[PDB]
């Protein structure tokens, strides 16, 4: 874009290339994408997670691995990248390993696949936590499409995926992820 302010003065623009920034970044930087209102994505190292929100309790505390301390996540996976990315995400979103409720992951001994689950239901005794979590997501995902409705059950699941090729590259999410973690 451009237009004339005066006779010899021009309004001009410069637009940075996200393709250029991402593809030519020699560092292994974390990417966070909002594909649409329901599906979010995060990538770090060899780990790539799809994040989804809905009322399905994929994991249950009676059968799956309770995570109170980051080291517990050693039982969630055989890939150090998956564990590292999960810990990094829970840190960046504001989860307090000391005071907040433990979350859940699937024991790596099972073969259904890697997945971890966080109760973000905005209801009852969980409301405060949910709210905090919401705020966290708002910092990590620009224009965060909050799917969790007040008073309703809402569980976040993060599971392995391939990076959507149509994912809008947004470096602001990366800056917030690096800043908050």
């Amino acid at each position, epitope marked *: 874009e451009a237009f004339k302010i005066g006779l010899h003065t021009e309004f001009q623009t410069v637009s940075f290339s996200m393709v250029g920034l991402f593809s030519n970044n020699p560092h292994d930087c974390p990417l966070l994408c909002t594909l649409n209102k329901s599906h979010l994505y995060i990538k770090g190292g060899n780990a790539s997670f799809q994040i*989804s929100f*809905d009322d*399905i*309790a*994929v994991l*249950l505390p*009676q*059968y799956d691995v309770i995570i109170q301390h980051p080291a517990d996540m050693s039982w969630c996976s*055989k890939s150090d990248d998956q564990i590292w990315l999960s810990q990094w995400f829970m840190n960046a979103v504001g989860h307090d390993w000391h005071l907040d409720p433990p979350f859940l992951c699937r024991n790596r*001994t*099972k*073969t*259904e*696949g890697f*997945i971890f689950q966080v109760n973000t239901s905005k209801t009852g005794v969980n409301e405060n936590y949910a709210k905090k979590f919401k705020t966290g997501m708002h910092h990590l995902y620009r224009e965060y499409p909050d799917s969790c409705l007040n008073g309703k059950l809402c569980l976040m*699941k993060a*599971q392995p995926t391939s990076w959507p090729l149509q994912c809008p590259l947004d470096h602001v999410n990366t800056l917030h992820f690096l800043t908050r973690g």
Partner: antibody
Amino acid sequence: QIQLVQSVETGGGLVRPGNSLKLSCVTSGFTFSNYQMHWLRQPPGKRLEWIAVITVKSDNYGANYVESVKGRFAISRDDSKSSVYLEMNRLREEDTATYFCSRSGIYDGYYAYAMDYWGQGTSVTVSS
Amino acid sequence: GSVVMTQSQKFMSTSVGDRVSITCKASQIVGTSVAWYQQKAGQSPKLLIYWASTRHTGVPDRFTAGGSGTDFTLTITNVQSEDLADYFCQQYATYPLTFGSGTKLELKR
């Protein structure tokens, strides 16, 4: 068309206790290497039973078994032949049943062991 | 320690066009991690329901299901002759996966 067809590799389904027996399950109509495969069995007058599962290459062909067969049965797969196999050793009369191979996929966006396709069944009778 | 899937009614009678309900009670809480299957003549089962209430592609809309925790119900509306079969539940929340003993749907006369 998605197909799962079972057979007894060697001999018939009638075997004597202590013998061995390999079941096969050949498939087509889908990318076999992207799906986990299961073996189950329906004993006479008893409810359907899960036996074993084997996952894909990206997860090191990991396998899980029920306790009653651990150390006796071995699930395996050949992706180049789109086939899954159940090798049953140390057979006892309690192993008599109709054995099924099955496929599980992804359900409402999440992997879970609901069985969306099954083989036709293979009758196995362990008797002296 | 296995989760028992209890179907206490082994046989159930109905007439074509009726609505019928087949129940399943798990001995442990399994959330909605439940599937429902149809089976005839001890042949290959057919998947009907997963996550307790989601209808599988290709299943008639006569079939619905619901429930949670321990109590799950499969409902067949406008029962058709071809719906006469065994019906059984399954939990896949924990190993070993386990199935109900089955409820056989039969015709009234």
